Design a protein around this ligand. Structure first.
Ligand SMILES: Nc1ncnc2c1ncn2[C@@H]1O[C@H](COP(=O)(O)OP(=O)(O)O)[C@@H](O)[C@H]1O
Ligand SMILES: Nc1ncnc2c1ncn2[C@@H]1O[C@H](COP(=O)(O)OP(=O)(O)O)[C@@H](O)[C@H]1O
Lengths: 547, 325, 148, 325
């Protein structure tokens, strides 16, 4: 009785879609309350979306309307479950949750009956995945009733919606929104729409969240600095890496998952081309989903890296401002604590540390990316991997030597520019006395000589970067040419179907993009190193003596 | 500048940071009886169609499950005679639910499960019909439209009556139907600072309506100018006649309440007069006129105004001059 | 930045030209993409300019304050007003941080909607490929170029 | 200690030894229209099922008694065509009662007794349908939920305004819908002993709400602090500021009445403030603020309070000091 069980599955989706519409229409006709498992709920709901797409694919392959209707109904049922959960996050209730729990139990029952009747006799895997997901969502609902007040004893002892991100005047809410919105920045809509109607102001934009204030970042940073001292230039670097911590690690994990999906795309291209030469529309739908997913996770990684960077900037700014207090004027008399030097410190170190902390998560995914690239191209090239492998191994050491020759010029560049800035400072605050008896030629020739030395450093850097780009293009093209020529006629005797060719070109381009980037990365990397060395020498100035 | 309540009678102040504990929906039908007509009609048709489709699905399924859906001659009698497909099943659902009872398809005494589904179908149908009639009737006692028909003059003038400063405003009725026991609550708002250093952003204070021996209410047949006399005790008594037109921020609102005859509900109307709306030293034109054998009222001169040579001075200074004269 | 921009614009030109060559029908689905992207870019431009301007106008006073604290050290440490000055700097740095945060958030939002636009274009490009270049066009080599 | 009426607005005092003369049920439908929704729905389905089963039994019996129930071909026509068992008889009862009228089983013109049973079945059905609609509609005019949406601040403070001691409490609205002609009855209770040796366990006395020239009622748009001034004539005027926090037992309740717009019913809300809830010498934070082009109200500061340097003394002693200063 297959059609009978299909109908029995269609029923509960219908029940839920029918109870949702009155409440949804009343709600459609500013305190955010979050429940445990919210993010887990949304993750599982997206996994349900995916498995339902797969079920629709099966129903297309088989066709009999009544045989693929269950997927089309669970689709709207899951979307309406999302609508319910949005309506509950916006206003809490004990009853709407039970309204979800009933549907979850009934859908689990129907799926179990399907599984049994199948066991007695592709469908198997999809049905099992749906069973597991519905069960986990059921456990989430049981957790939610266990927490506060589904039926449990009298009073919820309910949380008292979070005042950190919801109390007085909050104009920015990244941490104060739902699971699905954080990725798209849907909240921004209002703001960007508002900005066009009325120009933006500082009183227009809000305050900063509980977990965004520079006071707490400075607090965390000084606590970590103390813990590091109880256990120098290296110490403060260790403390910075410690302090950002989990957020930084998460940014890296998001980027690595985005990278694996980014490699996954070209494989779908291979499959599409192969079926074109001969299960194809599924390749298009899955490819579209994969590309969208990579984009979402890449942008989220970039955002969290930027968050960590701005918090770094705030914390080190307030740390150096607190330390300027205890600084003694005997240092201020010396060139090391020059006022212009200290303001250069603040500004350019804000800049350099922020840029390095935006580019560091990007490079913490280059190794995993290249490794997965080669482990994917083995299965596509075959015995013709040797050529590409030799190319991407011959790339690395010459690139290391080039990067060394680059860093050496860049550091001296920074020293010369730093002296030029102080010469300009002492030239501009005395232009009156300078033009009075016209000592201009001397100071101008001195700044010209300093500019010529700086230009020598810059031209060395530029020639080295040009050689870098030359290599990063010439080695790739030679690699592609050699590999293909080798496969067709040299040894392999297996005609490369065009799918293999285009998939190889795709994976190869994905591999090429990071190499061009790393050359620019060194420019920020040595600058971050120099900025922290300067910051540590500045922190090592003479204290003021307590009475 | 910002207004307190708009001329049309709607409230201006937008509320922020409401600690919603859910009472907004907990008023389930006293929420939707507030709505417009298209939304309420939409949600009523959606209630009805939702219930009908639910039970049509369950009936389709039960006829499928009994096996009466499998077309066969003999060895059975369908629980519902002459049922073939989903369409005829939905036709049976709408036939029994909304109580037309066509009887081409007969539910039979062979299956008690169909008896149960019918005996719950009908009671839920009757309950949802009962509520969807009571709430639409509770709606048709919306008499705010009767709050629309009332009218006030666009601007209010002040005058000198009986040797004392007075303020005159017009009201009136727009239909034959009277309004029972209408009462006037006349209020003034102002950002006020107490002598204790306390500053309030807005301060409602009652200004009396001056009728016979007392009384808060009036009788509306013809347009009656409401007549108050500001005295030294009154809160409005301190202002100046040259500072009102442009700078000061003084909203004088009137709230007229009363129950309409035929429905019996109690409606009201609210209007504001700003410092730039009100003017000084004028007099309205007499509306009522002795016509052929009756009193004719002309609403063309309702908002008309004539100049009157009255002294222009502040009510405090006018009271001091009355002490001097 | 200039060289990367040139490389990316030439890559975009190449990709559009290739997709147009492989399927002469795609020119029916390109104008809506261009229109929606143009409108969203126009909307982003004004908000971005406003956020950049506010960023600069908050970033100047913080550095002015830093310089003045650095030079007038003796007076500030004589009065023992250090709590007041640290509080002031906390105010200024929090305002700077929120300005920067909103600038980068608007950047991220534009990037996300642009990536959704790119997903749309690649999706229906591949769809028109698998449909037309197989059913009616019956061409094999163009599919790889188009999808790549 | 014991409270008079609870914060939620429900009454605390439990009644004992009620000489029930039966009026508790004599209010037959004004009793059950008070009930919750599950109980009222239960008793309505039980009314309907009771009547249906009663008449299904009597019809089963009449078809049995005529002998039309005995399956036989010819020499008869059943009073109700095509009736076989109890199940089909109950199907006929629900077919004619709730006015679906399936018509598979036909009542015939051979037996006038069946005509009588139909002509009473239908009228009783119609009467019980009429009452079970009127009472559910009379229910959906439960607007106490609108008594739920009103809110008062958790504790009330007293201050010094205009050189005289004053007590300030907040109120407010939670929806767009207004409440017509709301009035304030503000009462104080205390165990009192008269000079005649009479001791009362509880003594309600009115404390006035101080508005313009008079008036018992107010106008609710934004949160309005209610403003009374205790004077030597007032009953609360004798207490001390240090004896209120812990020992004394003084409940100050407020009862706000008003009729909601759309239904027209008159609702009210009741709240108590104990001697331990009230505090001395403070001031609320201004809620209303001039936003972009309107007035924004922030309910986060609704219950917020700031310290104010005001003298702390008893109202009797403060009046004596006013006589001295
Ligand atoms: N002839 C009329 N009949 C009925 N209602 C009127 C008439 N004229 C004006 N009204 C309404 O009543 C109010 C009377 O205002 P009025 O003092 O006449 O100023 P104006 O003539 O500029 O409208 C107006 O707001 C208008 O809405
Ligand atoms: N933001 C809000 N929106 C709506 N109602 C509120 C809000 N905050 C409190 N309330 C309700 O109104 C009353 C205001 O009390 P309040 O003086 O704010 O004390 P608290 O802040 O401790 O609740 C509370 O009893 C509460 O039930």
């Amino acid at each position: 009785n297959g059609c009978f069980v299909d109908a029995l599955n269609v029923v509960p989706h219908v029940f839920l879609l029918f109870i949702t519409f009155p409440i949804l229409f009343i709600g459609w006709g500013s305190t955010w309350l979050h429940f445990p498992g919210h993010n887990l709920r949304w993750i599982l709901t997206f996994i349900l979306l995916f498995v339902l797409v797969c079920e629709i694919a099966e129903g297309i392959l088989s066709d009999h309307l009544h045989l693929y209707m269950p997927a089309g109904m669970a689709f709207m049922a899951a979307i309406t479950s999302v609508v319910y959960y949005h309506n509950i996050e916006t206003s809490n209730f004990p009853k709407l949750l039970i309204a979800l729990l009933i549907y979850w139990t009934l859908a689990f029952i129907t799926k179990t009956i399907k599984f049994v009747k199948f066991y007695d006799h592709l469908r198997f895997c999809l049905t099992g995945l749906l069973v597991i997901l519905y069960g986990m969502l059921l456990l989430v609902e049981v957790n939610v009733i266990r927490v506060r007040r589904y039926i449990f004893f009298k009073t919820p002892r309910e949380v008292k919606p979070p005042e950190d991100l919801q109390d007085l005047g909050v104009r920015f809410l990244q941490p104060f929104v739902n699971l699905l919105s954080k990725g798209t920045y849907w909240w921004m809509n209002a703001f960007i729409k508002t900005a066009h109607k009325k120009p933006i102001d500082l009183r227009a934009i809000g305050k900063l969240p509980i977990a965004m204030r520079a006071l707490t970042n400075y607090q965390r940073l000084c606590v970590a600095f103390d813990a590091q001292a109880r256990k120098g230039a290296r110490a403060i670097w260790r403390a910075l890496c410690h302090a950002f911590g989990r957020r930084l690690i998460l940014s890296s994990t998001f980027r690595i998952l985005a990278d694996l999906l980014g490699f996954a795309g070209p494989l779908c291209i291979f499959g599409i081309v192969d079926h074109l030469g001969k299960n194809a529309y599924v390749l298009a739908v899955l490819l579209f989903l994969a590309l969208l997913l990579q984009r979402t996770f890449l942008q989220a990684s970039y955002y969290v890296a930027i968050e960590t960077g701005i918090n770094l900037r705030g914390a080190i700014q307030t740390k150096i401002y607190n330390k300027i207090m205890h600084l003694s004027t005997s240092n201020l008399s010396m060139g090391e604590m020059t006022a212009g030097q200290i303001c250069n410190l603040v500004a350019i170190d804000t800049n350099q540390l922020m840029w390095f902390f935006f580019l560091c998560p990007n490079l913490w995914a280059m190794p995993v990316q290249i490794i997965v690239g080669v482990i994917l191209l083995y299965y596509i090239l075959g015995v013709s991997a040797l050529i590409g492998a030799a190319v991407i191994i011959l790339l690395a050491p010459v690139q290391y030597f080039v990067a060394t020759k680059l860093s050496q010029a860049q550091r001296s560049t920074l020293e010369h520019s730093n002296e030029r800035l102080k010469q300009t400072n002492e030239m501009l605050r005395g232009m009156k006395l300078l033009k009075l008896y016209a000592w201009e030629s001397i100071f101008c020739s001195r700044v010209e000589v300093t500019r010529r030395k700086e230009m020598t450093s810059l031209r060395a850097f530029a020639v080295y970067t040009s050689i870098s780009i030359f290599m990063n293009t010439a080695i790739p093209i030679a690699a592609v040419l050699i590999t293909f020529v080798g496969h067709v006629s040299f040894f392999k005797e297996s005609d490369l179907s065009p799918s293999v060719a285009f998939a190889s070109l795709s994976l190869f381009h994905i591999l090429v993009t990071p190499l061009f980037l790393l050359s620019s990365v060194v420019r920020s990397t040595v600058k971050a190193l120099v900025s922290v060395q300067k910051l540590s020498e500045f922190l090592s100035s003479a204290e003021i003596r307590e009475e | 500048r910002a207004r307190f309540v708009s001329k049309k009678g709607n409230c201006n102040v937008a509320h922020k940071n409401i600690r919603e504990q859910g009472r907004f929906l907990q008023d389930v039908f006293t929420t939707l009886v507030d709505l417009k007509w298209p939304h309420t009609l939409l949600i009523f048709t959606m209630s009805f169609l939702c219930s009908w489709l639910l039970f049509a699905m369950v009936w389709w399924l039960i006829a499928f499950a009994h096996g009466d859906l499998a077309p066969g001659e003999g060895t059975n009698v369908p629980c519902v005679t002459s049922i073939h497909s989903f369409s005829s099943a939905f036709l049976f659902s709408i036939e029994v639910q909304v109580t037309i009872g066509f009887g081409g398809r007969m539910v039979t005494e062979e299956c008690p499960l169909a008896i149960l589904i019918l005996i719950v179908q009908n009671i839920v149908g009757l309950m949802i019909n009962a509520i969807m009639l009571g709430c639409i009737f509770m709606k048709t006692a919306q008499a705010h439209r009767r709050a629309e028909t009332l009218i006030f003059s666009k601007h209010a003038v002040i005058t000198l009556r009986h040797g004392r400063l007075c303020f005159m405003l017009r009201v009136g009725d727009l239909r034959k139907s009277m309004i029972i026991s209408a009462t006037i609550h006349m209020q003034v708002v102002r950002k006020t600072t107490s002598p204790e250093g306390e500053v309030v952003p807005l301060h409602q204070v009652d200004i009396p309506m001056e009728n016979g021996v007392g009384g808060n209410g009036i009788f509306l047949v013809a347009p009656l100018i409401i007549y108050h006399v500001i005295d030294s005790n009154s809160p409005l008594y301190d202002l100046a006649p040259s500072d009102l037109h442009h700078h000061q921020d003084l909203e004088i609102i009137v709230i007229l309440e009363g129950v309409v005859e035929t429905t019996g509900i109690t409606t009201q109307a609210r209007t504001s007069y700003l410092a730039d709306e009100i003017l000084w030293g004028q007099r309205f034109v007499p509306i009522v006129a002795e016509e052929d054998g009756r009193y004719s009222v002309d609403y063309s001169k309702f908002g008309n105004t004539i100049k009157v040579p009255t002294p222009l001075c502040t009510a405090r200074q006018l009271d001091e001059d009355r002490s001097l004269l | 930045t200039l060289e990367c921009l040139s490389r990316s614009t030439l890559l975009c030109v190449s990709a559009l030209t290739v997709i147009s060559y492989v399927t002469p029908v795609f020119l029916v689905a390109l104008l809506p993409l261009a229109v929606v992207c143009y409108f969203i870019q126009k909307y982003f431009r004004v908000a971005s300019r406003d956020l950049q301007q506010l960023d600069d106008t908050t970033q100047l006073p913080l550095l002015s304050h830093f310089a003045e604290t650095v030079e007038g050290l003796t007076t500030i440490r004589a009065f023992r007003y250090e709590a007041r000055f640290q509080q002031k700097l906390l105010e200024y740095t929090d305002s700077n941080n929120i300005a920067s945060l909103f600038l980068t958030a608007a950047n991220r939002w534009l990037e996300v909607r642009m990536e959704y636009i790119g997903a749309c274009v690649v999706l229906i490009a591949a769809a028109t490929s698998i449909s037309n270049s197989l059913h009616r066009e019956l061409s094999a080599g163009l599919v790889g170029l188009g999808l790549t």
